[PDB]
């Protein structure tokens, strides 16, 4: 059996800038049994029918998992723009897969604020599809060099979601799993 349980039922998820990817091959996949629970608050397939997966044989299945805001789940789709789509995780235009996201306010939100989840805020250019940028270099938004220290025209490129349980659904954490066939 394919280890879809390890991807979806993982205790800890990755940040969107350092998104995890799991290669899945050489196994029997319970495709139609993935969508048996009502927990998925977003299930959008692109290029494939979610009902026609049980009759399709693929060479590889890449499971990309991370955590983003609720209002940013709309960016996990081909041809989207913003901060998550441009600087953190970018899907190609001819994307062939399914995007599965669900609210995880119970786990990924803490009373004092969960600062483990971060997103890239500044970048000199947009990401190419499926490019992961994990550099923590001080961003030089201005003339003078930074020399590894932040100040005027020098900022840290990773901001953190202050995940608290009191936040609105648009600011609560959502665990995303992008299956690519």
């Amino acid at each position, epitope marked *: 059996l394919c280890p879809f349980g390890e991807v979806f039922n993982a205790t800890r998820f990755a940040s969107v800038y350092a998104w995890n990817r799991k290669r899945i091959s050489n196994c029997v996949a319970d495709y139609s049994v993935l969508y048996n629970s009502a927990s998925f608050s977003t299930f959008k397939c692109y290029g494939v029918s979610p009902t026609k997966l049980n009759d399709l044989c693929f060479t590889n299945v890449y499971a990309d998992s991370f955590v983003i805001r609720g209002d940013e789940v709309r960016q996990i789709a081909p041809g989207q723009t913003g901060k998550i789509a441009d600087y953190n995780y970018k899907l190609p235009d001819d994307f062939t897969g399914c995007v599965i996201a669900w609210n995880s306010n119970n786990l990924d939100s803490k*009373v004092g604020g969960n*600062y483990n989840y971060r997103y890239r805020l500044f970048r000199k250019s947009n990401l190419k599809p499926f490019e992961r940028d994990i550099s923590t270099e001080i961003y030089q938004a201005g003339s003078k060099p930074c020399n590894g220290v932040e100040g005027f025209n020098c900022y840290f490129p990773l901001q953190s979601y202050g995940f608290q349980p009191t936040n609105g659904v648009g600011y609560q954490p959502y665990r995303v799993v992008v299956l690519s066939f």
Partner: antibody
Amino acid sequence: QVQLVESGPGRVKPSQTLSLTCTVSGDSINSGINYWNWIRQPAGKELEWIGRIFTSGTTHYNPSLKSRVTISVDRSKNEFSLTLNSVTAADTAVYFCGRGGTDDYVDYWGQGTLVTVSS
Amino acid sequence: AIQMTQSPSTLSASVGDRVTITCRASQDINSWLAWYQQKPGKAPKLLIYDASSLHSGVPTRFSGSGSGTEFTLTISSLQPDDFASYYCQQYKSYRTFGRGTKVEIKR
């Protein structure tokens, strides 16, 4: 690997301000994803988390010590230090600094320094 | 704050026995737990995080289980290097430690 060494006066007086500095060698303090922590352990008691500083300067404190604790970073010297003011006799403990790749636990620790509080 | 009640306080064991230490959270902490080992006079060493994930370099005889409010650290075959103190730390709301469990030599 990351090596952390604690330094500071081990004989602070009551109501004064306790200051301790952790020298980080082997890894940089102003790059990467690191959570530089302060943990203290009274003699014969359990561990108590003081607070953390992320590589970007953002701090997170134990709520019981939030009003007396300030943890800063000297990026030139690649050190981070802890200041605890209004110190009473109950602040006598062994103080460790530590690195953590997450805001959750501490995987690297220092030898720990003893700080005594008495008149 | 979340209070960690650890049991038993003191534990007598022999080399090769199966040691079980339990940690109880005052409220639901999901699976956000850690286990440390500390010998007298030295710095603590990380054993388990996320309740069940073994820290790199830790012997496989250590195992962490449990979720919600009940957690258990199990040592399959005890060894002389394992006679120390063990703490559980939650990180569901800030970071709180349990009072610890001491594993002593039985005679």
